[PDB]
Design a protein around this ligand. Structure first.
Ligand SMILES: [Mg+2]
Ligand SMILES: [Mg+2]
Ligand SMILES: [Mg+2]
Length: 221
RNA sequence: CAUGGUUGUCGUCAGCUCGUGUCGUGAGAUGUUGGGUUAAGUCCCGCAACGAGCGCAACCCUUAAGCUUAGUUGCCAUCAUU
Protein backbone atom coordinates (compact mmCIF):
# COMPACT_ATOMS: atom_id res chain seq x y z
CA UNK A 1 0.00 0.00 0.00
CA UNK A 2 1.06 3.65 -0.38
CA UNK A 3 0.63 6.63 1.97
CA UNK A 4 -1.58 8.38 -0.61
CA UNK A 5 -3.76 5.25 -0.76
CA UNK A 6 -3.86 5.16 3.06
CA UNK A 7 -4.72 8.87 3.26
CA UNK A 8 -7.59 8.35 0.79
CA UNK A 9 -8.74 5.35 2.86
CA UNK A 10 -8.83 7.43 6.06
CA UNK A 11 -6.39 5.12 7.87
CA UNK A 12 -4.69 8.18 9.40
CA UNK A 13 -7.88 9.27 11.23
CA UNK A 14 -7.98 8.27 14.91
CA UNK A 15 -10.31 8.37 17.93
CA UNK A 16 -10.71 11.40 20.21
CA UNK A 17 -7.72 12.14 22.46
CA UNK A 18 -9.75 11.42 25.63
CA UNK A 19 -10.46 7.83 24.53
CA UNK A 20 -6.85 7.09 23.45
CA UNK A 21 -4.61 4.35 24.84
CA UNK A 22 -1.20 5.70 26.03
CA UNK A 23 0.68 2.62 24.79
CA UNK A 24 -0.09 3.60 21.17
CA UNK A 25 1.65 6.99 21.49
CA UNK A 26 4.53 5.90 19.23
CA UNK A 27 2.11 5.25 16.35
CA UNK A 28 0.42 8.66 16.80
CA UNK A 29 1.89 11.40 14.57
CA UNK A 30 -0.06 14.55 15.54
CA UNK A 31 -3.28 15.77 17.18
CA UNK A 32 -5.80 17.56 14.93
CA UNK A 33 -9.33 18.69 15.89
CA UNK A 34 -9.14 16.70 19.14
CA UNK A 35 -8.26 13.55 17.16
CA UNK A 36 -4.88 11.78 17.22
CA UNK A 37 -3.50 11.07 13.73
CA UNK A 38 -1.82 7.70 13.07
CA UNK A 39 1.66 7.89 11.52
CA UNK A 40 1.26 6.43 8.01
CA UNK A 41 5.00 5.74 7.67
CA UNK A 42 4.79 3.37 10.65
CA UNK A 43 1.58 1.89 9.20
CA UNK A 44 3.17 1.04 5.83
CA UNK A 45 6.06 -0.78 7.55
CA UNK A 46 3.59 -2.57 9.84
CA UNK A 47 1.35 -3.51 6.90
CA UNK A 48 4.37 -5.07 5.16
CA UNK A 49 5.30 -7.23 8.17
CA UNK A 50 1.75 -8.57 8.57
CA UNK A 51 1.47 -9.09 4.80
CA UNK A 52 4.71 -11.10 4.81
CA UNK A 53 3.54 -13.17 7.80
CA UNK A 54 0.14 -13.87 6.21
CA UNK A 55 1.85 -14.86 2.95
CA UNK A 56 4.17 -17.15 4.94
CA UNK A 57 1.28 -18.87 6.76
CA UNK A 58 -0.57 -19.17 3.42
CA UNK A 59 2.59 -20.66 1.87
CA UNK A 60 2.64 -23.16 4.75
CA UNK A 61 -1.07 -23.67 4.01
CA UNK A 62 -2.00 -22.43 7.49
CA UNK A 63 -5.66 -21.45 7.94
CA UNK A 64 -6.58 -17.84 8.80
CA UNK A 65 -9.72 -16.59 10.59
CA UNK A 66 -11.13 -13.10 9.94
CA UNK A 67 -13.15 -11.44 12.72
CA UNK A 68 -15.21 -8.31 12.00
CA UNK A 69 -18.38 -8.14 14.11
CA UNK A 70 -18.03 -4.35 13.82
CA UNK A 71 -20.63 -3.03 11.35
CA UNK A 72 -17.98 -1.37 9.16
CA UNK A 73 -15.97 -4.59 8.79
CA UNK A 74 -18.82 -7.12 8.53
CA UNK A 75 -19.09 -6.91 4.72
CA UNK A 76 -15.33 -6.60 4.19
CA UNK A 77 -14.42 -9.63 6.34
CA UNK A 78 -16.95 -11.85 4.53
CA UNK A 79 -15.86 -10.90 1.00
CA UNK A 80 -12.08 -11.05 1.56
CA UNK A 81 -12.29 -14.37 3.43
CA UNK A 82 -14.28 -15.90 0.55
CA UNK A 83 -11.75 -14.53 -1.96
CA UNK A 84 -8.82 -16.00 -0.02
CA UNK A 85 -10.82 -19.16 0.80
CA UNK A 86 -10.32 -18.50 4.52
CA UNK A 87 -12.66 -18.63 7.53
CA UNK A 88 -14.52 -15.53 8.75
CA UNK A 89 -16.68 -14.39 11.69
CA UNK A 90 -18.76 -11.25 11.10
CA UNK A 91 -21.85 -11.65 13.33
CA UNK A 92 -20.85 -12.67 16.88
CA UNK A 93 -17.90 -14.48 18.48
CA UNK A 94 -19.34 -17.37 20.50
CA UNK A 95 -17.50 -17.76 23.81
CA UNK A 96 -15.36 -20.90 23.58
CA UNK A 97 -15.26 -20.80 19.77
CA UNK A 98 -11.66 -22.08 19.83
CA UNK A 99 -11.21 -23.12 23.48
CA UNK A 100 -14.49 -25.09 23.49
CA UNK A 101 -14.12 -26.09 19.83
CA UNK A 102 -14.91 -29.66 20.91
CA UNK A 103 -18.47 -28.47 21.62
CA UNK A 104 -18.42 -26.00 18.70
CA UNK A 105 -17.26 -28.72 16.27
CA UNK A 106 -20.44 -30.69 17.05
CA UNK A 107 -22.48 -27.58 16.19
CA UNK A 108 -20.63 -27.34 12.86
CA UNK A 109 -21.49 -31.01 12.23
CA UNK A 110 -25.13 -30.28 13.10
CA UNK A 111 -25.37 -27.83 10.18
CA UNK A 112 -24.41 -30.63 7.78
CA UNK A 113 -26.85 -33.04 9.46
CA UNK A 114 -29.76 -30.60 9.05
CA UNK A 115 -28.86 -30.20 5.36
CA UNK A 116 -28.55 -33.99 5.03
CA UNK A 117 -32.08 -34.47 6.42
CA UNK A 118 -33.41 -31.96 3.86
CA UNK A 119 -31.51 -33.82 1.11
CA UNK A 120 -32.90 -37.12 2.43
CA UNK A 121 -36.43 -35.68 2.25
CA UNK A 122 -37.16 -36.53 5.90
CA UNK A 123 -38.29 -32.90 6.18
CA UNK A 124 -41.60 -33.67 4.43
CA UNK A 125 -42.05 -36.78 6.61
CA UNK A 126 -41.32 -34.81 9.80
CA UNK A 127 -44.22 -32.98 11.56
CA UNK A 128 -44.61 -29.37 10.39
CA UNK A 129 -43.87 -27.99 13.88
CA UNK A 130 -40.63 -30.02 14.00
CA UNK A 131 -39.59 -28.90 10.50
CA UNK A 132 -40.10 -25.22 11.37
CA UNK A 133 -37.98 -25.45 14.54
CA UNK A 134 -35.32 -27.44 12.65
CA UNK A 135 -35.11 -24.71 9.99
CA UNK A 136 -34.84 -22.03 12.70
CA UNK A 137 -31.92 -23.91 14.30
CA UNK A 138 -30.18 -24.18 10.92
CA UNK A 139 -30.51 -20.45 10.18
CA UNK A 140 -29.06 -19.57 13.60
CA UNK A 141 -26.15 -21.98 13.05
CA UNK A 142 -25.50 -20.50 9.58
CA UNK A 143 -25.68 -16.96 11.02
CA UNK A 144 -22.88 -17.55 13.55
CA UNK A 145 -20.98 -20.65 12.36
CA UNK A 146 -21.42 -20.20 8.58
CA UNK A 147 -17.95 -18.71 8.01
CA UNK A 148 -16.07 -21.42 9.95
CA UNK A 149 -18.13 -24.38 8.67
CA UNK A 150 -15.23 -25.49 6.46
CA UNK A 151 -12.73 -25.10 9.34
CA UNK A 152 -11.93 -28.42 11.04
CA UNK A 153 -8.76 -27.38 12.92
CA UNK A 154 -7.46 -24.38 14.89
CA UNK A 155 -6.71 -21.43 12.53
CA UNK A 156 -2.96 -20.83 12.18
CA UNK A 157 -3.53 -17.05 12.38
CA UNK A 158 -6.38 -14.68 13.27
CA UNK A 159 -7.16 -11.31 11.64
CA UNK A 160 -9.05 -8.88 13.90
CA UNK A 161 -10.45 -5.57 12.62
CA UNK A 162 -10.95 -4.03 16.08
CA UNK A 163 -9.05 -5.69 18.99
CA UNK A 164 -10.91 -3.63 21.61
CA UNK A 165 -14.30 -4.75 20.25
CA UNK A 166 -13.16 -8.37 19.75
CA UNK A 167 -11.78 -8.93 23.27
CA UNK A 168 -13.00 -12.55 23.48
CA UNK A 169 -11.32 -13.44 20.17
CA UNK A 170 -8.02 -11.92 21.35
CA UNK A 171 -8.24 -13.77 24.69
CA UNK A 172 -8.97 -17.17 23.12
CA UNK A 173 -6.14 -16.79 20.58
CA UNK A 174 -3.65 -15.76 23.29
CA UNK A 175 -4.69 -18.77 25.39
CA UNK A 176 -4.13 -21.09 22.40
CA UNK A 177 -0.95 -19.26 21.31
CA UNK A 178 -2.35 -18.38 17.88
CA UNK A 179 -0.55 -15.39 16.22
CA UNK A 180 -2.84 -12.36 15.87
CA UNK A 181 -2.83 -9.82 13.03
CA UNK A 182 -5.07 -6.86 13.88
CA UNK A 183 -6.09 -3.35 12.83
CA UNK A 184 -5.36 -1.31 15.98
CA UNK A 185 -6.87 2.18 16.38
CA UNK A 186 -5.62 4.76 18.91
CA UNK A 187 -8.12 3.61 21.57
CA UNK A 188 -7.02 -0.05 21.28
CA UNK A 189 -4.11 -1.66 23.16
CA UNK A 190 -1.33 -3.04 20.86
CA UNK A 191 0.47 -5.28 23.38
CA UNK A 192 -1.83 -8.29 22.88
CA UNK A 193 -1.74 -8.37 19.06
CA UNK A 194 1.37 -10.06 17.62
CA UNK A 195 1.20 -8.14 14.32
CA UNK A 196 -0.17 -4.61 14.77
CA UNK A 197 -1.34 -2.40 11.90
CA UNK A 198 -1.99 1.16 13.24
CA UNK A 199 -5.06 2.34 11.32
CA UNK A 200 -8.62 3.67 11.55
CA UNK A 201 -11.02 0.75 12.04
CA UNK A 202 -14.14 2.96 12.01
CA UNK A 203 -13.93 3.55 8.23
CA UNK A 204 -15.39 1.05 5.73
CA UNK A 205 -12.87 2.24 3.13
CA UNK A 206 -9.96 1.84 5.56
CA UNK A 207 -10.96 -1.65 6.75
CA UNK A 208 -11.61 -2.80 3.17
CA UNK A 209 -8.17 -1.67 1.95
CA UNK A 210 -6.34 -3.40 4.81
CA UNK A 211 -8.38 -6.63 4.74
CA UNK A 212 -7.96 -6.82 0.94
CA UNK A 213 -4.18 -6.48 1.24
CA UNK A 214 -4.12 -9.26 3.85
CA UNK A 215 -6.34 -11.41 1.61
CA UNK A 216 -3.92 -10.76 -1.27
CA UNK A 217 -1.05 -12.15 0.83
CA UNK A 218 -3.13 -15.28 1.48
CA UNK A 219 -3.90 -15.47 -2.26
CA UNK A 220 -0.18 -15.03 -3.02
CA UNK A 221 0.74 -17.96 -0.74
C1' C B 1 -33.80 -43.87 64.29
C1' A B 2 -30.70 -50.53 60.72
C1' U B 3 -33.73 -51.30 55.90
C1' G B 4 -36.30 -52.55 50.68
C1' G B 5 -40.92 -51.50 48.75
C1' U B 6 -45.02 -48.13 49.04
C1' U B 7 -47.18 -43.13 50.49
C1' G B 8 -48.20 -37.98 52.23
C1' U B 9 -46.12 -33.02 51.96
C1' C B 10 -44.17 -28.25 49.95
C1' G B 11 -46.70 -28.43 44.81
C1' U B 12 -48.32 -29.95 39.04
C1' C B 13 -44.60 -25.13 42.09
C1' A B 14 -41.33 -23.97 37.61
C1' G B 15 -37.94 -25.31 39.05
C1' C B 16 -33.41 -28.55 39.64
C1' U B 17 -28.86 -29.74 37.47
C1' C B 18 -24.76 -31.54 34.63
C1' G B 19 -20.58 -31.86 30.57
C1' U B 20 -17.07 -28.69 28.02
C1' G B 21 -15.26 -23.79 27.98
C1' U B 22 -14.19 -19.35 30.57
C1' C B 23 -13.65 -16.26 35.26
C1' G B 24 -12.15 -16.48 40.61
C1' U B 25 -5.96 -17.87 45.23
C1' G B 26 -10.46 -20.23 46.94
C1' A B 27 -15.39 -21.45 48.50
C1' G B 28 -17.76 -20.12 44.15
C1' A B 29 -19.59 -18.01 39.43
C1' U B 30 -21.22 -18.20 34.39
C1' G B 31 -24.58 -20.88 31.64
C1' U B 32 -29.87 -20.36 34.60
C1' U B 33 -28.49 -13.03 34.31
C1' G B 34 -30.51 -8.89 31.23
C1' G B 35 -34.76 -6.51 27.41
C1' G B 36 -39.63 -8.33 26.15
C1' U B 37 -43.10 -12.55 26.52
C1' U B 38 -45.73 -16.90 28.56
C1' A B 39 -49.68 -21.06 32.35
C1' A B 40 -44.75 -22.47 32.13
C1' G B 41 -36.42 -22.29 33.10
C1' U B 42 -42.76 -20.92 27.49
C1' C B 43 -40.47 -18.51 23.57
C1' C B 44 -37.68 -14.63 21.36
C1' C B 45 -33.62 -11.23 21.28
C1' G B 46 -29.04 -9.84 23.35
C1' C B 47 -25.07 -12.08 26.20
C1' A B 48 -18.22 -16.15 27.86
C1' A B 49 -20.72 -19.01 27.18
C1' C B 50 -21.65 -23.54 23.88
C1' G B 51 -24.58 -27.57 24.64
C1' A B 52 -27.35 -31.39 27.33
C1' G B 53 -30.58 -33.86 30.92
C1' C B 54 -34.78 -34.32 34.58
C1' G B 55 -38.96 -31.23 35.14
C1' C B 56 -42.94 -27.57 31.43
C1' A B 57 -45.52 -28.56 27.01
C1' A B 58 -46.89 -32.49 23.77
C1' C B 59 -47.88 -37.86 23.04
C1' C B 60 -52.63 -40.92 26.60
C1' C B 61 -58.00 -41.23 28.84
C1' U B 62 -62.66 -38.83 29.01
C1' U B 63 -66.15 -34.69 27.27
C1' A B 64 -68.16 -30.98 23.31
C1' A B 65 -69.05 -31.48 16.15
C1' G B 66 -69.04 -34.32 11.54
C1' C B 67 -67.83 -38.40 7.84
C1' U B 68 -67.33 -43.76 6.48
C1' U B 69 -68.37 -48.89 8.03
C1' A B 70 -72.10 -51.86 10.60
C1' G B 71 -77.15 -52.51 12.34
C1' U B 72 -79.01 -56.27 17.16
C1' U B 73 -80.85 -57.18 21.98
C1' G B 74 -80.48 -50.35 19.61
C1' C B 75 -83.83 -46.77 16.84
C1' C B 76 -88.93 -46.04 14.32
C1' A B 77 -89.61 -41.28 9.52
C1' U B 78 -91.86 -43.58 5.77
C1' C B 79 -97.19 -47.78 6.30
C1' A B 80 -100.01 -51.88 8.36
C1' U B 81 -100.54 -53.67 13.32
C1' U B 82 -100.49 -53.84 19.00
MG1 LIG C 1 -32.15 -21.50 39.52
MG1 LIG D 1 -37.41 -26.09 28.78
MG1 LIG E 1 -47.44 -32.83 31.32
Amino acid sequence: ISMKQLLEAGVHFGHQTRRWNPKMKKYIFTERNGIYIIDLQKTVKKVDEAYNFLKQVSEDGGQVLFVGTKKQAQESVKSEAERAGQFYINQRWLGGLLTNYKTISKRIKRISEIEKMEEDGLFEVLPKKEVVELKKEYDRLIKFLGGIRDMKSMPQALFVVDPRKERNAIAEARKLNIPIVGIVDTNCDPDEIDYVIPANDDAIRAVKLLTAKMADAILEG
